[PDB]
Amino acid sequence: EEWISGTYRKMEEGPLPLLTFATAPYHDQKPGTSGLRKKTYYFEEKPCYLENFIQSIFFSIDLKDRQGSSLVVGGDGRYFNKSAIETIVQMAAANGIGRLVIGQNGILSTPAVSCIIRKIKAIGGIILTASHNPGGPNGDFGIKFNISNGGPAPEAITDKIFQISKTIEEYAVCPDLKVDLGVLGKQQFDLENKFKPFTVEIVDSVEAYATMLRSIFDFSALKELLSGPNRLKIRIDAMHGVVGPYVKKILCEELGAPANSAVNCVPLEDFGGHHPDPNLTYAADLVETMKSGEHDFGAAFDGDGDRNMILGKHGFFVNPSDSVAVIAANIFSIPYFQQTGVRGFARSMPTSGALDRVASATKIALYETPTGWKFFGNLMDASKLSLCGEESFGTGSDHIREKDGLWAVLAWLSILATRKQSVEDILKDHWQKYGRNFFTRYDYEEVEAEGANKMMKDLEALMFDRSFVGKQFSAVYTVEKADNFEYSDPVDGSISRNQGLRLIFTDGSRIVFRLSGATIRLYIDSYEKDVAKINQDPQVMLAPLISIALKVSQLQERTGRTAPTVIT
Ligand SMILES: [Mg+2]
């Protein structure tokens, strides 16, 4: 009681052997921009799948950077996360790793992982999350690998991991290692044929991240905002995800918002049986409570805590493409940007051009990148990007090399405290100053692939016809440009094409198609400036361009979908 018995037993067992076991390679462990996600039974039931991938990650690191180095390990709290973390501890011990900094019970949000990596000078980190995907025995499981800068491994590293995993023959593991992920503090293990002991530091999940955020924002003004008598009634929905504890400690305990403010803030291994995705579909409960009109501010997070959804009173949903534009138009309400200044704005291409309005009003440069973190991090490490956001509920700054949902919530709270206006009023002022960029996005999830790819090809060849550019459509829009978006990275000279079908109208409106069973994504972004037509239902003002997109793409006849699975 407590560490005593474990220490005496550790001494009685003596040094723990390190053994090499044979394995057969899999041919589908190809990690993308968001790590490697399969079904949970892939990692739980398939023999040596997890061991093969983890050993491939270790083999992807040079031996000179592996020996005494520190590696952050943490997840969002999914089913099977704990046992896989234990396997990571054993294999990491056998692969000669200096120390593993793990959050208590394996709980560390992706922004927290980036923060700790950049703080303790770690070689990297392994994040056990599938982000917004569902979790559980019949759900999805994912493994991300971040490097020493705090961000996800670039394509060369994730590659090398994949090519190694296709040919892996054996792995090293310390099977008799038993670590208690539940108790904070340091735990060392004597390894056989090794003189130096292996170290596992179980750290508080929230402490470091909360300290960083305490340096980013003015926690005093947030105290006066969330904890006072005249307090801003907030309703934060963590969707049973990783951010719950952070909401409890940061927003509720430290900043003083009472416990009523948080909901679904206890991480569950199945996320309560729902998709931890913050949008108008999977987070409809939050919008339905926001319909009551008692709360002035609402927000939702995803599985690993890099997404955020922002709602105002009576469910005044603000789209991410707009939200980043409001954060940029009021960027000096945050002390961090006061200290650093604004080096640049950036958005994913399918994001609405609302950010370009504040980027052109001020003269801070704006970079339009494809979907994915590689380009945002590329511009961040060159001191060219200060605030970024993507339509996929992505908002973040250069404080870390991952996007951060709770950071965006604290930024919005800072803007509300500074301006002393409601969310809706602030966005009305924004829409009148810059002109509203009506934005919508339709998600047709898991349609069969061949028909979707054939639609994108036939449609693509329809754009490529010179008789298309110029031709008009009635409600009246005129086609100006039509291409498949490509991007030349200004940092490393990288190229990336087939990033989405872009249709630019002389009106400034854009219709974008993208393909992710396969999921079809429809992005629609029109601009409007005259004051008599900026306060309407966006579905109605956008219905023309939606009809043009569905009719030109012939999507329903080729997919049988009647309505999109998700609306934004
Ligand atoms: Mg996520």
Side-chain angles (χ1 to χ4, degrees):
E1 34 180 347
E2 324 296 323
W3 89 299
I4 310 285
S5 185
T7 312
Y8 279 139
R9 161 213 101 221
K10 278 173 188 177
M11 289 163 37
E12 264 313 289
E13 297 182 15
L16 309 155
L18 320 175
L19 301 158
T20 286
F21 287 92
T23 182
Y26 293 88
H27 304 87
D28 74 316
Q29 299 182 336
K30 190 174 179 296
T33 54
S34 286
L36 171 89
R37 324 204 189 289
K38 305 292 179 179
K39 304 287 287 182
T40 303
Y41 70 84
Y42 276 65
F43 294 90
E44 177 178 21
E45 299 283 346
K46 291 187 181 298
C48 298
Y49 201 90
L50 168 68
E51 284 83 3
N52 285 18
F53 191 70
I54 297 307
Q55 187 61 55
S56 300
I57 294 179
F58 291 155
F59 277 153
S60 148
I61 314 180
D62 301 56
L63 193 57
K64 312 95 208 167
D65 289 3
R66 272 228 314 274
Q67 306 282 42
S69 61
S70 301
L71 182 97
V72 177
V73 175
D76 45 4
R78 285 172 128 81
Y79 174 86
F80 203 71
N81 259 22
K82 286 161 163 281
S83 60
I85 281 173
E86 298 165 341
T87 301
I88 294 166
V89 172
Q90 302 182 340
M91 299 183 51
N95 281 267
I97 289 292
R99 155 190 319 233
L100 294 194
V101 172
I102 314 173
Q104 171 165 184
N105 300 113
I107 291 297
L108 298 161
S109 67
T110 299
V113 175
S114 187
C115 163
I116 299 178
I117 284 175
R118 301 166 43 89
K119 180 181 180 182
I120 72 172
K121 301 179 184 61
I123 186 60
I126 300 181
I127 320 171
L128 289 82
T129 177
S131 188
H132 51 281
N133 292 330
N138 306 129
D140 293 10
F141 192 95
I143 299 181
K144 302 184 61 175
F145 173 57
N146 289 26
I147 58 179
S148 65
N149 81 330
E155 180 176 7
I157 300 177
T158 67
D159 267 22
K160 202 177 182 185
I161 297 172
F162 178 44
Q163 279 67 31
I164 283 165
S165 70
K166 281 187 292 183
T167 88
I168 186 166
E169 204 103 77
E170 56 192 16
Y171 65 99
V173 57
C174 177
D176 303 319
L177 202 152
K178 298 171 294 297
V179 51
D180 185 13
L181 306 172
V183 282
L184 294 188
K186 179 181 52 180
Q187 307 174 31
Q188 278 137 295
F189 309 86
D190 288 322
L191 302 182
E192 196 189 51
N193 306 339
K194 294 289 173 297
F195 158 93
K196 277 185 170 56
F198 174 59
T199 307
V200 170
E201 187 178 359
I202 311 295
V203 76
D204 188 86
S205 304
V206 198
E207 187 175 16
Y209 175 82
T211 294
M212 166 177 80
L213 290 207
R214 193 179 311 111
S215 58
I216 299 292
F217 308 95
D218 191 325
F219 272 18
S220 301
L222 298 183
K223 280 167 186 164
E224 304 214 26
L225 177 75
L226 306 179
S227 59
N230 198 350
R231 97 198 149 274
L232 183 90
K233 309 185 177 184
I234 70 178
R235 170 93 155 173
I236 305 298
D237 179 12
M239 305 196 67
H240 306 130
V242 81
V243 201
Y246 302 81
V247 178
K248 298 234 209 256
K249 265 273 191 283
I250 297 176
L251 285 169
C252 290
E253 292 183 13
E254 176 163 1
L255 299 177
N260 48 329
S261 305
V263 67
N264 300 323
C265 42
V266 172
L268 311 189
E269 300 188 356
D270 58 353
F271 303 97
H274 307 148
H275 290 205
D277 194 7
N279 53 32
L280 298 177
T281 306
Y282 299 106
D285 308 300
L286 176 63
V287 316
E288 215 61 30
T289 86
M290 287 302 295
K291 291 291 184 55
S292 62
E294 45 175 322
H295 301 94
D296 318 280
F297 176 85
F301 306 118
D302 74 320
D304 63 333
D306 46 14
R307 310 279 204 79
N308 71 95
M309 181 180 65
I310 301 295
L311 321 189
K313 210 186 218 178
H314 300 102
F316 181 80
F317 161 75
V318 317
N319 59 91
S321 312
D322 275 9
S323 173
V324 49
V326 198
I327 297 176
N330 306 264
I331 207 172
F332 289 139
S333 304
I334 306 169
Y336 173 75
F337 297 104
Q338 301 178 12
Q339 304 159 2
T340 78
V342 193
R343 340 179 192 277
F345 297 132
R347 68 154 211 260
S348 70
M349 179 274 301
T351 294
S352 97
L355 185 61
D356 308 21
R357 295 289 144 174
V358 312
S360 298
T362 73
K363 298 86 185 194
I364 286 101
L366 177 123
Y367 313 85
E368 188 178 2
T369 65
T371 307
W373 179 260
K374 185 174 72 68
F375 318 99
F376 284 133
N378 274 17
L379 285 160
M380 276 189 190
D381 293 325
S383 293
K384 295 271 131 214
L385 169 57
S386 191
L387 173 79
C388 71
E390 331 167 82
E391 45 79 25
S392 57
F393 299 87
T395 319
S397 73
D398 59 323
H399 68 287
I400 51 181
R401 293 306 169 263
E402 288 270 14
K403 272 169 173 51
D404 196 349
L406 184 52
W407 173 95
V409 169
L410 291 202
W412 253 106
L413 298 178
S414 298
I415 297 180
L416 310 164
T418 309
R419 297 202 56 183
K420 306 164 173 72
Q421 295 166 331
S422 68
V423 176
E424 182 167 354
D425 286 15
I426 289 178
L427 209 30
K428 292 279 189 57
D429 194 289
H430 198 274
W431 285 337
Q432 290 154 2
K433 180 173 184 176
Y434 298 96
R436 180 178 187 171
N437 306 74
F438 287 95
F439 180 84
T440 199
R441 171 170 74 79
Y442 287 5
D443 291 328
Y444 301 81
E445 290 176 11
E446 281 289 306
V447 310
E448 86 96 35
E450 179 63 88
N453 299 85
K454 191 196 65 173
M455 157 213 183
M456 296 290 293
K457 185 269 160 53
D458 297 323
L459 174 54
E460 162 163 13
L462 186 134
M463 315 292 213
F464 291 1
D465 203 68
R466 272 81 195 188
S467 170
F468 189 76
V469 153
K471 274 260 75 193
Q472 332 186 280
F473 297 104
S474 67
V476 171
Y477 306 89
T478 69
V479 177
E480 196 212 289
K481 194 177 182 177
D483 68 331
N484 203 332
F485 180 70
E486 92 264 350
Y487 178 77
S488 299
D489 195 292
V491 180
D492 59 344
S494 154
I495 69 184
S496 45
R497 306 173 200 111
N498 189 177
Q499 306 305 318
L501 300 188
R502 276 197 318 158
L503 313 187
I504 326 294
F505 297 89
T506 61
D507 167 68
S509 306
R510 306 175 303 114
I511 289 187
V512 180
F513 285 92
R514 283 192 71 247
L515 214 170
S516 300
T519 297
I520 297 181
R521 307 237 187 260
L522 168 52
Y523 313 87
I524 302 146
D525 167 35
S526 44
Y527 175 78
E528 193 60 63
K529 182 48 187 284
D530 304 321
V531 307
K533 47 222 83 149
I534 49 179
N535 287 337
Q536 328 163 221
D537 197 274
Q539 294 315 292
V540 158
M541 198 72 172
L542 279 177
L545 285 166
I546 304 167
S547 175
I548 299 175
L550 292 176
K551 283 170 180 173
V552 156
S553 61
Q554 284 187 346
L555 167 61
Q556 322 238 41
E557 305 101 285
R558 305 191 186 200
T559 55
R561 287 297 152 293
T562 285
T565 78
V566 175
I567 303 264
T568 291

Coordinates of all heavy atoms in Angstrom, one line a residue, residues 388-434:
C388 N -5.2 29.4 -38.1 CA -5.7 28.6 -39.1 C -7.0 27.9 -38.7 O -7.3 27.7 -37.5 CB -4.6 27.5 -39.6 SG -4.4 26.2 -38.3
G389 N -7.8 27.6 -39.7 CA -9.0 26.9 -39.5 C -9.5 26.2 -40.8 O -9.3 26.8 -41.9
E390 N -10.2 25.1 -40.6 CA -10.8 24.4 -41.8 C -12.3 24.1 -41.5 O -12.7 24.0 -40.3 CB -10.1 23.1 -42.0 CG -8.6 23.0 -41.7 CD -8.0 21.6 -41.7 OE1 -7.7 21.1 -42.7 OE2 -8.0 21.0 -40.6
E391 N -13.0 24.0 -42.6 CA -14.4 23.8 -42.5 C -14.8 22.6 -41.7 O -15.9 22.5 -41.2 CB -15.0 23.6 -43.9 CG -14.2 22.7 -44.8 CD -14.4 21.2 -44.6 OE1 -15.5 20.9 -44.1 OE2 -13.5 20.4 -44.9
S392 N -13.9 21.6 -41.6 CA -14.1 20.4 -40.8 C -14.1 20.6 -39.3 O -13.6 19.8 -38.6 CB -13.1 19.3 -41.2 OG -11.8 19.7 -41.0
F393 N -14.6 21.8 -38.9 CA -14.6 22.2 -37.5 C -13.1 22.2 -36.9 O -12.9 21.8 -35.8 CB -15.5 21.2 -36.6 CG -16.9 21.3 -37.1 CD1 -17.3 20.4 -38.1 CD2 -17.8 22.1 -36.5 CE1 -18.7 20.4 -38.5 CE2 -19.1 22.1 -36.9 CZ -19.6 21.3 -37.9
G394 N -12.2 22.8 -37.7 CA -10.8 22.9 -37.3 C -10.5 24.3 -37.0 O -10.7 25.2 -37.8
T395 N -9.8 24.5 -35.8 CA -9.4 25.8 -35.4 C -8.2 25.7 -34.6 O -8.1 24.9 -33.6 CB -10.5 26.6 -34.6 OG1 -11.8 26.4 -35.2 CG2 -10.2 28.1 -34.6
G396 N -7.1 26.5 -34.9 CA -5.9 26.4 -34.1 C -4.9 27.5 -34.5 O -5.1 28.2 -35.4
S397 N -3.9 27.6 -33.6 CA -2.8 28.6 -33.9 C -1.5 27.9 -33.9 O -1.4 26.6 -33.9 CB -2.8 29.7 -32.8 OG -2.4 29.2 -31.6
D398 N -0.4 28.6 -33.9 CA 0.9 28.1 -33.9 C 1.5 27.8 -32.5 O 2.7 27.5 -32.3 CB 1.9 29.0 -34.6 CG 2.0 30.4 -34.0 OD1 0.9 30.9 -33.5 OD2 3.1 31.0 -33.9
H399 N 0.6 27.8 -31.4 CA 1.0 27.5 -30.1 C 1.4 26.0 -30.0 O 2.3 25.6 -29.2 CB -0.1 27.8 -29.1 CG -1.3 27.0 -29.2 ND1 -2.2 27.1 -30.2 CD2 -1.8 26.0 -28.4 CE1 -3.2 26.2 -30.1 NE2 -3.0 25.5 -29.0
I400 N 0.7 25.1 -30.8 CA 1.1 23.7 -30.9 C 1.0 23.3 -32.4 O 0.6 24.1 -33.2 CB 0.2 22.8 -30.1 CG1 -1.3 23.1 -30.3 CG2 0.6 22.9 -28.6 CD1 -2.2 22.2 -29.5
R401 N 1.5 22.1 -32.7 CA 1.4 21.6 -34.1 C 0.3 20.6 -34.3 O 0.4 19.7 -35.0 CB 2.7 21.0 -34.5 CG 3.9 22.0 -34.6 CD 3.5 23.1 -35.5 NE 4.4 24.2 -35.5 CZ 4.2 25.4 -34.8 NH1 3.1 25.5 -34.0 NH2 5.1 26.3 -34.8
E402 N -0.9 20.9 -33.6 CA -2.1 20.2 -33.8 C -3.2 21.2 -33.6 O -3.1 22.2 -32.9 CB -2.3 19.0 -32.9 CG -1.4 17.8 -33.3 CD -2.1 16.8 -34.3 OE1 -3.1 17.2 -34.9 OE2 -1.6 15.7 -34.4
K403 N -4.4 21.0 -34.2 CA -5.5 21.8 -33.9 C -6.1 21.5 -32.6 O -6.0 20.4 -32.0 CB -6.6 21.7 -35.0 CG -6.3 22.6 -36.2 CD -7.2 22.2 -37.4 CE -7.0 23.3 -38.5 NZ -5.6 23.5 -38.8
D404 N -6.8 22.5 -32.0 CA -7.2 22.5 -30.6 C -8.6 23.0 -30.4 O -8.8 24.2 -30.7 CB -6.2 23.3 -29.7 CG -6.3 23.0 -28.3 OD1 -7.3 22.3 -27.9 OD2 -5.5 23.4 -27.5
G405 N -9.5 22.2 -30.0 CA -10.9 22.6 -29.8 C -11.2 23.5 -28.6 O -11.8 24.5 -28.7
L406 N -10.7 23.0 -27.5 CA -10.8 23.8 -26.2 C -10.1 25.1 -26.3 O -10.6 26.1 -25.8 CB -10.3 23.0 -25.0 CG -10.5 23.6 -23.7 CD1 -12.0 24.1 -23.5 CD2 -10.1 22.7 -22.5
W407 N -9.0 25.2 -27.0 CA -8.3 26.4 -27.3 C -9.2 27.4 -28.0 O -9.2 28.6 -27.7 CB -7.0 26.2 -28.0 CG -6.3 27.5 -28.4 CD1 -5.3 28.1 -27.7 CD2 -6.5 28.2 -29.6 NE1 -4.9 29.2 -28.4 CE2 -5.6 29.3 -29.6 CE3 -7.3 28.0 -30.7 CZ2 -5.5 30.2 -30.6 CZ3 -7.3 29.0 -31.8 CH2 -6.4 30.0 -31.7
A408 N -9.9 26.9 -29.1 CA -10.8 27.7 -29.8 C -12.0 28.2 -29.0 O -12.5 29.3 -29.1 CB -11.3 26.9 -31.0
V409 N -12.5 27.3 -28.1 CA -13.5 27.7 -27.1 C -13.0 28.8 -26.3 O -13.7 29.8 -26.1 CB -14.0 26.5 -26.3 CG1 -14.9 27.0 -25.2 CG2 -14.7 25.5 -27.2
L410 N -11.8 28.7 -25.7 CA -11.3 29.8 -24.9 C -11.1 31.1 -25.7 O -11.2 32.2 -25.1 CB -10.0 29.3 -24.2 CG -10.1 28.3 -23.1 CD1 -8.9 28.3 -22.2 CD2 -11.4 28.4 -22.3
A411 N -10.7 30.9 -27.0 CA -10.6 32.1 -27.8 C -11.9 32.8 -28.0 O -12.0 34.0 -27.9 CB -10.0 31.7 -29.1
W412 N -13.0 32.0 -28.3 CA -14.3 32.6 -28.4 C -14.8 33.3 -27.1 O -15.3 34.4 -27.1 CB -15.3 31.6 -28.9 CG -15.7 31.7 -30.3 CD1 -15.4 30.9 -31.4 CD2 -16.6 32.7 -30.8 NE1 -16.0 31.4 -32.5 CE2 -16.7 32.5 -32.2 CE3 -17.3 33.8 -30.3 CZ2 -17.5 33.3 -33.1 CZ3 -18.1 34.6 -31.1 CH2 -18.2 34.3 -32.5
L413 N -14.5 32.6 -26.0 CA -14.8 33.2 -24.7 C -14.1 34.5 -24.5 O -14.6 35.5 -23.9 CB -14.6 32.2 -23.6 CG -15.3 30.9 -23.6 CD1 -14.9 30.0 -22.4 CD2 -16.8 31.2 -23.5
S414 N -12.8 34.6 -24.9 CA -12.1 35.8 -24.8 C -12.7 36.9 -25.7 O -12.7 38.1 -25.2 CB -10.6 35.6 -25.2 OG -10.0 34.6 -24.3
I415 N -13.1 36.5 -26.9 CA -13.8 37.5 -27.7 C -15.1 38.0 -27.2 O -15.4 39.2 -27.2 CB -13.9 37.0 -29.1 CG1 -12.5 36.7 -29.7 CG2 -14.7 38.0 -30.0 CD1 -12.6 36.1 -31.1
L416 N -15.9 37.1 -26.6 CA -17.1 37.6 -25.9 C -16.9 38.4 -24.7 O -17.6 39.4 -24.5 CB -17.9 36.3 -25.5 CG -18.2 35.2 -26.6 CD1 -18.7 34.0 -25.9 CD2 -19.2 35.7 -27.6
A417 N -15.8 38.1 -24.0 CA -15.5 38.9 -22.8 C -15.0 40.3 -23.2 O -15.3 41.3 -22.6 CB -14.4 38.2 -21.9
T418 N -14.2 40.4 -24.3 CA -13.7 41.6 -24.8 C -14.8 42.5 -25.4 O -14.9 43.7 -25.0 CB -12.6 41.4 -25.8 OG1 -11.6 40.5 -25.3 CG2 -11.9 42.7 -26.1
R419 N -15.6 42.0 -26.3 CA -16.6 42.7 -27.0 C -17.8 43.0 -26.2 O -18.5 43.9 -26.4 CB -16.9 42.1 -28.3 CG -15.8 42.0 -29.3 CD -16.3 41.8 -30.7 NE -17.2 42.8 -31.1 CZ -17.8 42.9 -32.3 NH1 -17.6 41.9 -33.2 NH2 -18.6 43.9 -32.6
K420 N -18.1 42.1 -25.2 CA -19.3 42.2 -24.3 C -20.6 42.2 -25.2 O -21.5 43.0 -25.0 CB -19.2 43.5 -23.4 CG -17.9 43.5 -22.6 CD -17.7 44.9 -22.0 CE -16.5 45.0 -21.1 NZ -15.2 44.8 -21.8
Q421 N -20.6 41.3 -26.2 CA -21.8 41.2 -27.0 C -22.1 39.7 -27.2 O -21.2 38.8 -26.9 CB -21.6 41.8 -28.4 CG -21.4 43.3 -28.4 CD -20.9 43.9 -29.7 OE1 -20.2 43.2 -30.4 NE2 -21.3 45.1 -30.0
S422 N -23.3 39.4 -27.6 CA -23.7 38.0 -27.8 C -23.0 37.5 -29.1 O -22.4 38.2 -29.9 CB -25.2 37.9 -28.0 OG -25.6 38.5 -29.2
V423 N -23.0 36.1 -29.2 CA -22.4 35.5 -30.4 C -23.1 36.0 -31.6 O -22.4 36.4 -32.6 CB -22.5 34.0 -30.2 CG1 -21.9 33.3 -31.5 CG2 -21.7 33.5 -29.0
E424 N -24.4 36.0 -31.6 CA -25.2 36.4 -32.8 C -24.9 37.8 -33.2 O -24.7 38.2 -34.3 CB -26.7 36.2 -32.5 CG -27.5 36.6 -33.7 CD -29.0 36.1 -33.6 OE1 -29.2 35.3 -32.6 OE2 -29.8 36.4 -34.4
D425 N -24.8 38.7 -32.2 CA -24.5 40.1 -32.4 C -23.1 40.3 -33.0 O -22.9 41.1 -34.0 CB -24.7 41.0 -31.2 CG -26.1 41.2 -30.8 OD1 -27.0 40.5 -31.3 OD2 -26.4 42.1 -29.9
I426 N -22.2 39.6 -32.5 CA -20.8 39.7 -33.0 C -20.7 39.2 -34.4 O -20.1 39.8 -35.3 CB -19.8 38.9 -32.1 CG1 -19.6 39.6 -30.7 CG2 -18.5 38.7 -32.8 CD1 -18.7 38.8 -29.8
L427 N -21.5 38.2 -34.7 CA -21.4 37.7 -36.1 C -22.3 38.5 -37.1 O -22.0 38.6 -38.3 CB -21.9 36.2 -36.2 CG -21.3 35.4 -37.3 CD1 -19.9 35.9 -37.7 CD2 -21.2 33.9 -37.0
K428 N -23.2 39.3 -36.5 CA -23.9 40.3 -37.3 C -23.0 41.4 -37.7 O -22.9 41.8 -38.8 CB -25.2 40.8 -36.6 CG -26.3 39.7 -36.4 CD -27.1 39.6 -37.7 CE -28.3 38.7 -37.4 NZ -29.2 39.2 -36.3
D429 N -22.3 42.0 -36.7 CA -21.3 43.0 -36.9 C -20.3 42.5 -38.0 O -19.9 43.3 -38.9 CB -20.6 43.4 -35.6 CG -19.8 44.7 -35.7 OD1 -18.8 44.7 -36.4 OD2 -20.2 45.7 -35.1
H430 N -19.8 41.3 -37.8 CA -18.8 40.7 -38.8 C -19.4 40.7 -40.2 O -18.8 41.1 -41.1 CB -18.4 39.3 -38.3 CG -17.1 38.9 -38.9 ND1 -17.1 38.2 -40.1 CD2 -15.8 39.0 -38.6 CE1 -15.9 37.9 -40.5 NE2 -15.1 38.3 -39.5
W431 N -20.6 40.1 -40.3 CA -21.3 40.0 -41.6 C -21.5 41.3 -42.3 O -21.5 41.4 -43.5 CB -22.6 39.2 -41.4 CG -22.4 37.7 -41.2 CD1 -21.3 37.0 -41.5 CD2 -23.4 36.9 -40.6 NE1 -21.5 35.7 -41.2 CE2 -22.8 35.6 -40.6 CE3 -24.6 37.0 -40.0 CZ2 -23.4 34.5 -40.0 CZ3 -25.3 35.9 -39.5 CH2 -24.7 34.7 -39.5
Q432 N -21.8 42.4 -41.5 CA -22.0 43.7 -42.1 C -20.7 44.4 -42.4 O -20.7 45.1 -43.4 CB -22.9 44.5 -41.1 CG -24.3 44.1 -41.0 CD -25.0 44.5 -39.7 OE1 -24.4 45.2 -38.9 NE2 -26.2 44.1 -39.5
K433 N -19.7 44.1 -41.6 CA -18.4 44.8 -41.9 C -17.7 44.2 -43.2 O -17.2 44.9 -44.0 CB -17.5 44.7 -40.7 CG -16.1 45.4 -41.0 CD -15.3 45.5 -39.7 CE -14.0 46.3 -39.9 NZ -13.2 46.4 -38.6
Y434 N -17.7 42.8 -43.2 CA -17.0 42.1 -44.3 C -17.9 41.5 -45.4 O -17.3 41.1 -46.4 CB -16.1 41.0 -43.7 CG -15.1 41.5 -42.7 CD1 -15.3 41.5 -41.3 CD2 -13.9 42.0 -43.2 CE1 -14.4 42.0 -40.4 CE2 -12.9 42.4 -42.3 CZ -13.2 42.4 -40.9 OH -12.2 42.9 -40.0

